[PDB]
Design an enzyme around this catalytic site. Structure first.
Site, PDB file in Angstrom:
ATOM      1  N   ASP A 128       5.582   2.469   4.068  1.00 56.76           N
ATOM      2  CA  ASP A 128       6.777   2.536   4.917  1.00 56.76           C
ATOM      3  C   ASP A 128       7.478   1.174   4.782  1.00 56.76           C
ATOM      4  O   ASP A 128       6.991   0.170   5.302  1.00 56.76           O
ATOM      5  CB  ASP A 128       6.432   2.869   6.399  1.00 56.76           C
ATOM      6  N   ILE A 165       7.717 -11.229  -6.071  1.00 56.41           N
ATOM      7  CA  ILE A 165       7.815  -9.848  -6.593  1.00 56.41           C
ATOM      8  C   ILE A 165       8.924  -9.034  -5.885  1.00 56.41           C
ATOM      9  O   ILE A 165       9.004  -7.814  -6.035  1.00 56.41           O
ATOM     10  CB  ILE A 165       6.405  -9.165  -6.533  1.00 56.41           C
ATOM     11  N   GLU A 199      -2.577  -4.728  -0.164  1.00 59.20           N
ATOM     12  CA  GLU A 199      -3.125  -4.306  -1.433  1.00 59.20           C
ATOM     13  C   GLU A 199      -1.908  -4.230  -2.375  1.00 59.20           C
ATOM     14  O   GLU A 199      -0.822  -3.794  -1.974  1.00 59.20           O
ATOM     15  CB  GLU A 199      -3.797  -2.941  -1.248  1.00 59.20           C
ATOM     16  N   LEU A 200      -2.074  -4.719  -3.592  1.00 61.78           N
ATOM     17  CA  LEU A 200      -0.986  -4.733  -4.553  1.00 61.78           C
ATOM     18  C   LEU A 200      -0.905  -3.432  -5.335  1.00 61.78           C
ATOM     19  O   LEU A 200      -1.917  -2.953  -5.839  1.00 61.78           O
ATOM     20  CB  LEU A 200      -1.120  -5.943  -5.487  1.00 61.78           C
ATOM     21  N   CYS A 201       0.311  -2.865  -5.409  1.00 60.56           N
ATOM     22  CA  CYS A 201       0.651  -1.682  -6.195  1.00 60.56           C
ATOM     23  C   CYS A 201       1.551  -2.251  -7.299  1.00 60.56           C
ATOM     24  O   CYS A 201       2.750  -2.461  -7.074  1.00 60.56           O
ATOM     25  CB  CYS A 201       1.371  -0.638  -5.342  1.00 60.56           C
ATOM     26  N   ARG A 210      11.207   6.828  -1.902  1.00 64.21           N
ATOM     27  CA  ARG A 210      11.446   5.385  -1.719  1.00 64.21           C
ATOM     28  C   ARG A 210      10.310   4.669  -0.914  1.00 64.21           C
ATOM     29  O   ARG A 210      10.243   3.440  -0.922  1.00 64.21           O
ATOM     30  CB  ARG A 210      12.814   5.119  -1.055  1.00 64.21           C
ATOM     31  N   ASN A 211       9.463   5.427  -0.206  1.00 69.31           N
ATOM     32  CA  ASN A 211       8.353   4.865   0.589  1.00 69.31           C
ATOM     33  C   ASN A 211       7.000   5.024  -0.115  1.00 69.31           C
ATOM     34  O   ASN A 211       5.952   4.828   0.479  1.00 69.31           O
ATOM     35  CB  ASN A 211       8.341   5.413   2.017  1.00 69.31           C
ATOM     36  N   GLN A 228      12.451  -7.872   4.707  1.00 69.31           N
ATOM     37  CA  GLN A 228      13.260  -8.095   5.919  1.00 69.31           C
ATOM     38  C   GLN A 228      13.148  -9.514   6.522  1.00 69.31           C
ATOM     39  O   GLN A 228      14.131 -10.021   7.040  1.00 69.31           O
ATOM     40  CB  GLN A 228      12.908  -7.045   6.993  1.00 69.31           C
ATOM     41  N   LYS A 259       3.360 -10.937   2.114  1.00 66.11           N
ATOM     42  CA  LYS A 259       4.641 -10.876   2.831  1.00 66.11           C
ATOM     43  C   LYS A 259       4.761 -12.136   3.646  1.00 66.11           C
ATOM     44  O   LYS A 259       3.883 -12.436   4.455  1.00 66.11           O
ATOM     45  CB  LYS A 259       4.723  -9.677   3.779  1.00 66.11           C
ATOM     46  N   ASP A 286       9.350   9.126   8.114  1.00 68.80           N
ATOM     47  CA  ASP A 286      10.206   8.730   6.996  1.00 68.80           C
ATOM     48  C   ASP A 286       9.578   8.985   5.625  1.00 68.80           C
ATOM     49  O   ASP A 286       9.462   8.070   4.796  1.00 68.80           O
ATOM     50  CB  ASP A 286      10.649   7.255   7.173  1.00 68.80           C
TER      51      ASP A 286
HETATM   52  C1  LIG Z   1       6.727  -1.957  11.761  1.00 69.44           C
HETATM   53  C2  LIG Z   1       5.907  -1.233  10.723  1.00 69.44           C
HETATM   54  C3  LIG Z   1       6.392  -1.035   9.442  1.00 69.44           C
HETATM   55  C4  LIG Z   1       5.652  -0.360   8.492  1.00 69.44           C
HETATM   56  C5  LIG Z   1       4.400   0.134   8.810  1.00 69.44           C
HETATM   57  N1  LIG Z   1       3.646   0.863   7.845  1.00 69.44           N
HETATM   58  N2  LIG Z   1       3.149   2.100   8.194  1.00 69.44           N
HETATM   59  C6  LIG Z   1       2.517   2.510   7.108  1.00 69.44           C
HETATM   60  C7  LIG Z   1       1.821   3.860   7.091  1.00 69.44           C
HETATM   61  C8  LIG Z   1       0.311   3.661   7.166  1.00 69.44           C
HETATM   62  C9  LIG Z   1       2.279   4.690   8.284  1.00 69.44           C
HETATM   63  C10 LIG Z   1       2.166   4.599   5.801  1.00 69.44           C
HETATM   64  C11 LIG Z   1       2.598   1.565   6.075  1.00 69.44           C
HETATM   65  C12 LIG Z   1       3.325   0.505   6.550  1.00 69.44           C
HETATM   66  N3  LIG Z   1       3.703  -0.675   5.943  1.00 69.44           N
HETATM   67  C13 LIG Z   1       3.719  -0.853   4.576  1.00 69.44           C
HETATM   68  O1  LIG Z   1       3.642   0.100   3.813  1.00 69.44           O
HETATM   69  N4  LIG Z   1       3.827  -2.150   4.160  1.00 69.44           N
HETATM   70  C14 LIG Z   1       3.806  -2.603   2.822  1.00 69.44           C
HETATM   71  C15 LIG Z   1       4.774  -3.472   2.346  1.00 69.44           C
HETATM   72  C16 LIG Z   1       4.758  -3.871   1.024  1.00 69.44           C
HETATM   73  C17 LIG Z   1       3.785  -3.417   0.141  1.00 69.44           C
HETATM   74  C18 LIG Z   1       3.806  -3.801  -1.288  1.00 69.44           C
HETATM   75  C19 LIG Z   1       4.965  -4.274  -1.889  1.00 69.44           C
HETATM   76  C20 LIG Z   1       4.972  -4.578  -3.232  1.00 69.44           C
HETATM   77  C21 LIG Z   1       3.816  -4.407  -3.949  1.00 69.44           C
HETATM   78  N5  LIG Z   1       2.680  -3.964  -3.410  1.00 69.44           N
HETATM   79  C22 LIG Z   1       2.692  -3.674  -2.105  1.00 69.44           C
HETATM   80  C23 LIG Z   1       2.813  -2.558   0.641  1.00 69.44           C
HETATM   81  C24 LIG Z   1       2.820  -2.155   1.960  1.00 69.44           C
HETATM   82  C25 LIG Z   1       3.899  -0.065  10.084  1.00 69.44           C
HETATM   83  C26 LIG Z   1       4.650  -0.739  11.025  1.00 69.44           C
END
Ligand SMILES: Cc1ccc(-n2nc(C(C)(C)C)cc2NC(=O)Nc2ccc(-c3cccnc3)cc2)cc1
Length: 252
Positions: A147, A14, A83-85, A133-134, A18, A37, A129
């Site tokens: 994030d 999907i 969790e999937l969005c 985009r987040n 990094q 991931k 941040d």
């Molecule tokens: C080093 C580090 C980096 C990021 C975070 N971090 N911190 C947060 C908050 C709770 C503060 C908002 C969320 C995330 N990671 C994230 O949101 N991860 C994430 C990645 C992909 C997806 C995703 C992608 C595609 C489809 N569905 C979900 C969801 C969450 C903490 C530490």
């Protein structure tokens, strides 16, 4: 927190991240659609540490409008289960669905994000941040704060000038994020240099009122953009006023 590999069925890629690809899939404990991931070079303790730091940070949070960590598989190949969005990134969602989205939906997204941020502030956690985009879209009536990452055009003057990131700098970024939602995913200060932003903020200049944005909502954005951080509202105030603005739009 640790999940057995057997309970995870891996689906299609999907997008890329990094450390490696992000896949979609299903998890059974009832039955949940999940984001997986992966990490290509996680045999390196150094890369594994940086990769798994995401899980360490995300574990402490539990909110309906904050992306949820489902768990982690620490045995190689190491995976992070989220969790999937399904509807993806808010910016694309807003651009694509621009003429399918009413004002009441845009305010709903801003309100849902303010509830997520009131929860983070309640935990004394600074996001640093806040930008469209987040944000991910779970459904048409549901957004989640994440994030996935310098963003000068979103940043509070004290963050630009002194690298100071606080609850008050988060409120500034939230105002810019609110402007992005009402601008349907249009980036702030387009065709303006990152050095030209600093000068405009100091002079008193702010992002213009978006077309068809209620003036009350724009008055709230300008409060978030108070030069003095101590004059900025807190997320409890923002959440309550966005709720009021949302009811005024729902009751035409
Ligand atoms: C080093 C580090 C980096 C990021 C975070 N971090 N911190 C947060 C908050 C709770 C503060 C908002 C969320 C995330 N990671 C994230 O949101 N991860 C994430 C990645 C992909 C997806 C995703 C992608 C595609 C489809 N569905 C979900 C969801 C969450 C903490 C530490």
């Amino acid at each position: 927190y640790e999940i057995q590999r057997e309970r995870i069925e891996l689906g299609r890629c999907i997008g890329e991240g990094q450390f490696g690809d992000v896949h979609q899939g299903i998890y059974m404990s009832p039955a949940l659609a999940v984001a997986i991931k992966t990490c290509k070079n996680c045999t390196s303790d150094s890369v594994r540490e940086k990769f798994l730091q995401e899980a360490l940070t995300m574990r402490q949070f539990d909110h309906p409008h904050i992306v949820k960590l489902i768990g982690v598989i620490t045995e190689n190949p190491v995976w992070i289960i989220m969790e999937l969005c399904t509807l993806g990134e808010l910016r694309s969602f807003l651009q694509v669905r621009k003429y399918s989205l009413d004002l009441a939906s845009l305010i709903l997204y801003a309100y849902q994000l303010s509830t997520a941020l009131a929860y983070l502030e309640s935990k004394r956690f600074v996001h640093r941040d806040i930008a469209a985009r987040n944000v991910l879209v779970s459904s048409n009536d549901c957004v989640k704060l994440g994030d996935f990452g310098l963003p000068i055009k979103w940043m509070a003057p004290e963050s630009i000038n002194f690298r100071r990131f606080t609850s008050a700098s988060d409120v500034w970024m939230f105002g810019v994020c609110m402007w992005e939602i009402l601008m349907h995913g249009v980036k702030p200060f387009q065709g303006v240099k990152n050095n030209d932003v600093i000068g405009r903020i100091e002079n008193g200049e702010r992002l213009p009122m978006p077309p068809n944005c209620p003036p009350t909502l724009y008055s709230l954005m300008t409060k978030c953009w108070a030069y003095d951080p101590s004059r900025r509202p807190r997320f409890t105030e923002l959440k309550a006023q966005l709720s009021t603005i949302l009811e005024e739009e729902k009751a035409q």
